[PDB]
């Protein structure tokens, strides 16, 4: 798995192969593992398939539940309930979440969650088992306030990278773009991102 | 403990049980009675793991006791077999099972017949012309199946009796210091006091 | 160790012409050790059989379950019941022990009272339902069960012939296996009669 | 398994069971669990089938070489030896053997040595061996005398295997007879145990348990 | 076990083999892989063929019971929702495998499911021992836009591969079409391509064949009157 | 007794009317990381065999000396060398069975899975395969690891059994062994989109193909996939 | 860890007539829920009318039958092309299993062929060499399946004769070749539909006086 | 196998050593001689492992009965001793060791006087006025140490030796089928047919 | 550990860091990993260093013994040295080799020797715990024919991003330049290399 969420001037973007294996078999190779848990916090999902969408759903119920009695909540408090969830179920649970979201006031922001249930607020987060190969690349070429354009290519480029090398993570290159303008889903097929 | 040993005969049952206790290296005892009589026409012998055979021995023999005193009524040998196999089937797939293997001599005075049960601790119940639990049925089945015959006396249910504790002093590595042997027939229940 | 081959034991059914068969052994073992010759596996609740293989303490508890459950069943519906209808209580009790299951393999067999339509069924210890409409096999020589019927079953027998075909599927089928044997009962079943056969075999 | 062999008036009588198993898997109730290693000796056959097999016929083989070196008969204290010494070679790779070497000579008489794959080797008067010598011991130490005669300890023989093959699970088949004297062994036939069950019970009396 | 999913113009087609196995032994030549939660809900199970027959039923019941109350046609998301939490719960102990098709006010769908409980979407879907060669056949084959014909003959073909192919799957193809506005077709043994040959001999006895110690009329009645 | 270390992938041939085909990817996995991108993994001995090799890479490597110095053995003092007494695909592969056989039984294997394609000198088709464990069988279709799973059954469509080799061409053979490639590199974590090729006639001879690409996939239609069951954004 | 032992499936069928034999087997090969081969030839024809098969483990089957062809070879090399008689056979291949007793070959062996009074014979090994000579014996993996038809169809086991009730036997009547190949056939269609490793084909080699003959039947493929 | 006791009087030395042989469940013999003579005044009794006990001991007699040929002269008990624990201690790092506990018995010509020595399969040789291996020893040791005292006469050590035996057939587990009992002194080595 | 080997225009440069570690302790933070088996042909070692010192004492006395002989070796045939300790070896030892040399005839060659033994000519190689953290990067930044100062830099950024990332890797950057006009030794210190 190869995730990855980043932060820029107009917002935040989420990024993620579409590969799900169970040992070497290709389970899934159309796989999307951005999902919503309300209409401008998204979670990028790596590990157990079962775990983090049982996870996701928890998360939407209560972030639903939330809107419903004190308005639209925080990314930071999105970012709570998924920590409170895998850190007091952390010895029965494998998932590595991250998580991203645009305010207003606070603009974009992401929060990674890795295995022990610990969370970290980043410029941006990279995490699955293809990350490995991308933090010398990443850390280079990553810089604050990008625009659209280069948010997208940094994570097209980055990704493109993480599942050339890494077996766990193939197919189609998702993303999903978090602005003041509203939601977008972007699409990167093997044929575009191979020859980068 | 070791050896336990059952015949049901013409018109009586007939259960033999060894004396000896070991605990690991020496032997404690050799004059143990391995049984407890539940009523008046029904007796029962054990061996299992230690503690736990007596603990449900008795623990059996209260209960029928209960009910005897209840209904002023003592229950067929079939019924009393019935609820020791439930027990024991209860008790299997609990926390701690009862590691307890049973025969059920008794004389149903309904239909005058004896009865012979032959239950493990698993809750197994099979109704015997004879039987034995542990290592003890390897050499006595075979001696019964050549000289039981299902009218014998118990004279001779006794002296056929006595050819299956020889062979198994012959042939047993353990000394299991001799047998105490009980009859259960119309009149009750008594112990052979010389054997 | 494997509780499904400590006491051993064997149980077929057949279907025929406006007919069913269901046949065991009597054999009750501990591993090595024969221990009875008379442990039916057969029991009957009406006009409904059940033939159950595997622990003896489980076949026994299962049998007084049953007989449990088909007595209240009768006294509420004022009717016996069905071999369809049982065969789905069977099921519904055998999986409410998914994670502690009985180790058992029972076989259904019996006519249905109004449509007079054969029927057989088998399962596994947790209560998956196999309903074949030639022939059902159970116990420790289940392999040996198989490779008899699959060859000498044939369609429509007639009572009598059926007879001939179950009984040799289950005596060559326990001679094969060290767990079973020991004597053998055979049950042919018509709308309304039933024949009990037992049958003279090799005695080790 | 159940194999027996003991001394009497007149020579040694040894009877076989012929089940081999493979778990609760029947391989086959037809195996020659005695071998014929000479017109004088016999071995009987229990545990591995293999084991027994090849090394008793490879003992046939060093037996006829003693007496083509001694130019006179191999004693069965020899003979028993032979086969404690190779199989004590092999202990603990895990050869499974439970054998009665069984013979007859001028000096020694009548003789039975039991030979085990552990090295055990010991002379004596009854030995019973494999899953199902508990129970034919049961029926040969009640009936047993030195006095019997050939035709009565043939028939203890054949009814303490039949003992054994009706209680244990792993032994049946059929009984193989042998009886050996000053001149030799005499084969006595294969008994179906299918058949002698019913015969011995009719006209014994015995197994009144079984209904027949 | 082979069992394969399909969506096609106007709905969804499920399809699978028919046989079962206790290790290497066929215990049913002729088992029913396809179950029915609800009238245009049904699913393919694979793996402990208990657990899936269980776990249908148990939601089946649970979706029969919500439609009345709700006074709607049940939607296969519910049954989705409903199975994925209950396994989850289960924590893979459950062994059930299953792909969830059906047709209902929304539209046509098609699901995985996973023991763990994890779902997947898709527009074809394969699981069991047989998926691989199913899978095969299906990546090969499939398309945008297949009409109704076209789906049946790519659903049974799939199942045909893991037949052959595949040791765990054989005997017959089951198949279940379900269009929208249109009644659920369930098609028991759609194809039937593994009869067996006549014998080269009949086995039927003589009779008096086997010997037989006693006889005895069993008594199946009631007690008696007079 | 050890492990694979540097792995390759499936294996995969079959047999057409005139000769057979066989192919294999270029990557050397390290584990799941795809560390090796230019292994080849077809290794042709003469001019009518090609030997596929599929696991461990050290071993490969040992095994396509093996053959290399089997070459040069069966030249000395053979002056038929390049002609009646050339290696023949059936003499390479007894040769492989013998080593691969003898080595398991010194618990000391081999890892790897082997095809040997070729044509005979009679024009035959030869096609076998052989394994760590000395296991060996032959089939109209073979194929190693995953291949044996997905690529197997595709093939096996075209040709089911002996009778469907002659009404085989060559065309469609290939046809179905890229379509195969392809279905591996959808589904099979380890595999990688370069790939060789190589056909052996009785006609034509040993044509080689290096540097082939996996093409015409069907990806567009994952845009509509949304979620894992309830989410519609 | 290392495991150098693999199971290839398949069945195999020996059975000895009056003054024929015949030994049958699958011609499917497998590992695990794959299969390898629907046509890979198991019973070979080992010369001196003697016909073999090794089922289990396919490379020490293989091996076995390699190594058993090459002592025929030598036999009639070291004793003046004597003809290897199917008792001496035997006893030959009992050495060669057990010369690998601590490593053994993992197969079931069985042998068919003629003795030496022109009479059907077949005999039967166990992987470590002990061996038996019989009229009947299934081998490999639906050898349970196979056997207890045989000892009801050939050697008429609990079969006894209308009127009598269990008193007189059905006699032991001989049977002909195209008897046996029936009841070969309807032995490997049995299996075949119950035993998931069985199936694909069944090749026959029969034995007589004549020499080695061959016949070939369909089986399911599924 | 089971029992073997030692026992150094005044003048002699006694050996007792159990008859039963068994193998798991059944004893396949109950007259079984634990012992062989290495030399005229010189026995060795032997427990362990079936078949390592007789192939060590015969190894060990051949092996003094070869020094006793080519000599003319018997080995003191001292020497004999000494030999059978460098075999043993030879033996224990080996790649199979003998699996052996001996008693040696002897009478020294010489010195006029009866020797034992107690020698276990790690080849630990001590000298002791009564010996024991296994579990005897844990029954045996209690009563020597009471009663023995070293001017006793062989009566009285056979006395003090029927006593040993009495509290072994009381208190183990174990029916060892009595012992044959034999003594060593300046005349040689003779066995005592009534016990 | 970190280690590389890349061929350029002039010929072949090696790089790797200097960090022995036992567990989390570090052992030896000054360790020399580019170690000479000819004149000019060089080995970067990773695994065990046990190991990788007798494999590589053993080459050089082979090597010196071939020279004698035959004359200066080739990289190929240094490489099937190594190839041949480790292969024949692989049951017994730890060790992951690159072997960089430069001849006039074939100029810069690189191979690398994994756990396994096997042996695979390439362009530039990575290798050791912390080279998994920099495929992205080499992968991108790679070029055929570079000139001596832009292939250095190429190694230090990237071993500068394995240092930062893997905890086994870190100390001094050493680097050897093997060419036609000799043997060149480079060492980048912390402060250099970090603030790239
Ligand atoms: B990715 O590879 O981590 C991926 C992310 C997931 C949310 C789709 N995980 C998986 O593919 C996991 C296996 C796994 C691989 C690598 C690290 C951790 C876990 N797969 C599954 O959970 C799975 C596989 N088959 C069926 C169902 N679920
Ligand atoms: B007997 O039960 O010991 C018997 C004697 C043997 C010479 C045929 N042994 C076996 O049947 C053994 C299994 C066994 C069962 C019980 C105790 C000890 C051993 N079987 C085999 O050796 C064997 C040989 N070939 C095929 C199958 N089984
Ligand atoms: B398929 O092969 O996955 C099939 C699908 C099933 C739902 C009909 N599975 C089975 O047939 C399973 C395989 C299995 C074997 C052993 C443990 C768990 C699963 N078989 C059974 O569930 C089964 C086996 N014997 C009797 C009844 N059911
Ligand atoms: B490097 O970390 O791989 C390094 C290369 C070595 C040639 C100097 N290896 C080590 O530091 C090894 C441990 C190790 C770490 C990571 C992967 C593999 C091995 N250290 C030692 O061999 C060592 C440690 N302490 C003392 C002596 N040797
Ligand atoms: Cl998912
Ligand atoms: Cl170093
Ligand atoms: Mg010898
Ligand atoms: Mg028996
Ligand atoms: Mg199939
Ligand atoms: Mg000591
Ligand atoms: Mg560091």
């Known amino acids: 798995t190869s995730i990855m969420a980043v932060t820029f001037k107009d917002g935040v973007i989420l990024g993620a192969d579409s590969r799900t294996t169970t040992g070497a078999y290709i389970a899934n190779r159309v796989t999307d593992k951005l999902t919503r848990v309300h209409d401008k916090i998204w979670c990028c999902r790596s590990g157990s398939a079962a775990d983090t969408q049982a996870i996701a759903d928890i998360v939407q119920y209560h972030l639903e539940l939330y809107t419903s009695q004190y308005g639209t909540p925080s990314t930071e408090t999105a970012a709570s309930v998924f920590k409170e969830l895998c850190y007091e179920n952390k010895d029965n649970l494998t998932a590595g979440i991250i998580v991203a979201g645009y305010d207003d006031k606070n603009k974009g922001e992401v929060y990674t969650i890795p295995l022990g249930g610990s969370v970290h607020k980043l410029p941006y987060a990279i995490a699955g088992s293809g990350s490995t190969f991308i933090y010398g690349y990443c850390d280079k070429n990553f810089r604050e306030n990008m625009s659209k354009e280069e948010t997208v290519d940094f994570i097209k480029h980055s990704l493109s990278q993480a599942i050339k090398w890494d077996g766990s993570s193939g197919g189609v290159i998702r993303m999903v773009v978090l602005t003041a303008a509203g939601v977008e889903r972007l699409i990167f097929y093997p044929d575009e991102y191979e020859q980068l | 403990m070791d050896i336990i040993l059952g015949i049901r005969v013409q018109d009586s049952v007939i259960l033999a049980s060894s004396k000896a206790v070991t605990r690991g290296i020496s032997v404690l005892k050799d004059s143990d009675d391995k049984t407890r009589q539940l009523s008046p026409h029904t007796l029962m012998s054990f061996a299992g793991e230690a503690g736990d055979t007596v603990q449900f021995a008795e623990y059996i023999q209260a209960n029928i006791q209960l009910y005897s005193i209840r209904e002023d009524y003592e229950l067929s040998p079939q019924a009393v077999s019935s609820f020791v196999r439930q027990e024991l089937a209860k008790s299997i797939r609990s926390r701690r099972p009862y590691q307890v293997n049973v025969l059920i001599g008794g004389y149903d005075k309904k239909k005058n017949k004896p009865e012979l049960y032959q239950i493990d601790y698993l809750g197994t119940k099979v109704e015997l012309p004879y039987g034995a639990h542990g290592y003890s049925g390897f050499y006595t089945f075979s001696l019964l199946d050549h000289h039981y015959r299902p009218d014998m006396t118990t004279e001779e249910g006794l002296d056929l009796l006595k050819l299956c504790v020889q062979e198994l002093e012959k042939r047993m590595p353990m000394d299991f210091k001799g047998v105490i042997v009980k009859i259960v027939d119309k009149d009750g229940i008594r112990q052979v006091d010389d054997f | 160790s494997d509780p499904s081959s400590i006491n051993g034991g064997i149980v077929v059914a057949m279907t025929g012409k406006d007919c069913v068969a269901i046949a065991c052994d009597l054999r009750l073992g501990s591993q090595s050790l024969g221990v009875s010759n008379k442990f039916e596996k057969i029991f009957h609740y009406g006009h409904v059989f059940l033939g159950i293989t595997g622990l003896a303490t489980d076949v026994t508890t299962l049998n007084e379950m049953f007989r449990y459950k088909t007595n209240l069943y009768k006294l509420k519906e004022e009717r016996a019941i069905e071999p369809e209808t049982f065969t789905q209580l069977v099921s519904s009790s055998l999986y409410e022990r998914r994670f502690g299951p009985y180790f058992v393999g029972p076989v259904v067999a019996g006519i249905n009272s109004k449509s007079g339509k054969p029927f057989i069924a088998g399962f596994d210890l947790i209560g998956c339902i196999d309903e074949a409409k030639d022939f059902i096999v159970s116990g420790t020589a289940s392999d040996q069960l198989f490779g008899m019927c699959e060859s000498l079953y044939e369609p429509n027998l007639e009572p009598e012939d059926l007879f001939e075909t179950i009984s040799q599927a289950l005596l060559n089928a326990a001679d094969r296996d060290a767990l079973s044997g020991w004597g053998a009962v055979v049950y042919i079943i018509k709308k309304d009669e039933v024949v009990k056969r037992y049958l003279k075999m090799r005695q080790d | 398994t159940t194999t027996l062999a003991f001394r009497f008036q007149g020579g040694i009588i040894v009877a076989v069971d012929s089940r081999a198993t493979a778990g609760n898997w029947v391989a086959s109730q037809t195996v020659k669990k005695v071998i014929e290693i000479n017109p004088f000796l016999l071995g009987t056959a229990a545990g591995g089938a293999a084991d027994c097999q090849f090394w008793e016929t490879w003992l046939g083989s060093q037996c006829r070489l003693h007496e083509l070196r001694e130019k006179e008969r191999i004693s069965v204290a020899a003979a028993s030896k032979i086969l404690s010494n190779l199989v004590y070679q092999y202990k603990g790779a895990g050869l499974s053997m439970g054998t009665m070497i069984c013979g007859y000579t001028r000096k020694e008489g009548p003789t039975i040595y039991y030979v085990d794959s552990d090295g055990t080797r010991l002379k004596g008067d009854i030995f019973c061996v494999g899953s199902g010598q508990t129970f034919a011991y049961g029926v040969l130490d009640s009936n047993y005398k030195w006095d019997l005669s050939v035709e009565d300890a043939l028939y203890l023989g054949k009814r303490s295997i039949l003992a054994a093959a009706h209680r244990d699970a792993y032994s049946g088949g059929s009984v193989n007879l042998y009886h050996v004297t000053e001149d030799g062994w005499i084969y006595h036939g294969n008994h179906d145990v299918g058949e002698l069950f019913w015969k011995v019970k009719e006209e014994e009396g015995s197994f009144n348990n079984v209904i027949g | 076990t082979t069992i394969v999913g399909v969506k096609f113009n106007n709905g969804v087609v499920i399809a699978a083999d028919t046989r079962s196995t206790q290790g290497p032994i066929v215990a049913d030549k002729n088992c029913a892989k396809l179950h029915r939660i609800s009238p245009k809900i049904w699913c393919a199970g694979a793996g402990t063929a208990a657990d899936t027959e269980a776990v249908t039923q148990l939601i089946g019941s649970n979706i029969e019971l919500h439609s009345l109350y709700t006074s709607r046609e049940p939607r296969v998301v519910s049954a989705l929702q409903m199975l994925k939490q209950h396994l989850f719960k289960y924590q893979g102990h459950i062994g059930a495998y299953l792909i969830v098709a059906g047709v209902d006010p929304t539209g046509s769908h098609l699901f995985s499911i996973h023991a763990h409980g994890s779902t997947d979407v898709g527009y074809y879907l394969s699981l069991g021992s047989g998926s691989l060669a199913a899978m095969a056949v299906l990546e090969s084959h499939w398309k945008q836009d297949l009409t109704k014909e076209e789906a049946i003959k790519l659903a049974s073909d799939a199942i045909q591969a893991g037949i052959w192919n595949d040791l765990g799957s054989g005997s017959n193809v089951d198949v279940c079409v379900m269009e929208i506005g249109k009644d659920a077709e369930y098609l028991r043994n759609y194809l039937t391509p593994n009869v067996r040959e006549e014998k080269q001999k009949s086995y039927k006895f003589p009779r008096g064949t086997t010997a037989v110690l006693k006889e005895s009329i069993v008594n199946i009645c009631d007690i008696q009157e007079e | 007794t050890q492990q694979p270390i540097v792995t390759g992938t499936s294996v995969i041939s079959m047999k057409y009317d005139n000769g057979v085909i066989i192919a294999a990817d270029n990557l050397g996995s390290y584990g799941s990381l795809l560390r090796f991108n230019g292994v080849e993994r077809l290794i042709p001995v003469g001019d009518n065999t090609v030997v596929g090799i599929s696991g461990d890479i050290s071993d490969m490597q040992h095994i396509e000396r093996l053959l290399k110095d089997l070459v040069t053995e069966n030249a000395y003092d053979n002056p038929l060398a390049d002609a009646e007494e050339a290696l023949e695909p059936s003499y390479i592969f007894e040769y492989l069975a013998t080593v691969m056989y003898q080595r398991r039984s010194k618990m000391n294997p081999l890892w790897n899975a082997i095809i040997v394609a070729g044509v005979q000198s009679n024009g035959d088709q030869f096609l076998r395969y052989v394994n760590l464990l000395g296991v060996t069988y032959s089939s109209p279709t073979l194929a190693t690891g995953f291949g044996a799973h997905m690529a197997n059954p595709l093939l096996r469509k075209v040709v089911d059994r002996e009778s469907d080799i002659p009404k085989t061409t060559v065309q469609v053979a290939e046809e179905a062994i890229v379509n195969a490639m392809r279905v591996l590199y959808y589904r099979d974590a380890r595999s990688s989109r370069n790939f060789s090729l190589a056909i052996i006639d009785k006609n034509t001879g040993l044509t080689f193909k290096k540097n082939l690409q996996v093409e015409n996939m069907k990806w567009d239609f994952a845009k509509d996939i949304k979620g894992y069951g309830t989410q519609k954004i | ?222």
């Open chain 7, 1 to 222: 860890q290392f495991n150098p032992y693999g199971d290839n499936g398949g069945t195999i069928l020996g059975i000895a007539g009056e003054d024929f034999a015949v030994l049958a087997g699958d011609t499917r090969n497998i590992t695990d829920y794959s299969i390898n081969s629907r046509y890979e030839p198991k019973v070979f024809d080992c010369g001196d009318n003697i016909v073999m098969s090794a089922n289990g483990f396919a490379a020490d089957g293989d091996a076995l039958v390699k190594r058993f062809k090459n002592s025929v070879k030598w036999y009639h090399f070291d004793h003046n092309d004597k003809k290897l008689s199917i008792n001496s056979a035997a006893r030959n291949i009992q050495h060669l299993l057990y010369g690998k007793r601590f490593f053994p070959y993992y197969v079931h062996t069985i042998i068919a062929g003629l003795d030496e009074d022109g009479k059907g014979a077949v005999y039967s090994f166990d992987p470590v060499g002990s061996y038996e000579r019989e009229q009947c014996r299934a081998g490999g993996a639906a050898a349970s399946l196979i056997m207890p038809f045989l000892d009801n169809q050939v050697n008429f086991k609990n079969q006894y004769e209308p009127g009598t009730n269990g008193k007189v036997k059905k006699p032991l009547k001989y049977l002909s070749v195209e008897e046996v190949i029936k009841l070969v056939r309807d032995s490997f269609t049995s299996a075949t539909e119950r035993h998931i490793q069985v199936g694909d084909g069944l090749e026959i080699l029969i034995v007589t006086k004549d020499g080695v003959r061959k016949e070939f039947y369909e089986l399911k493929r599924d």
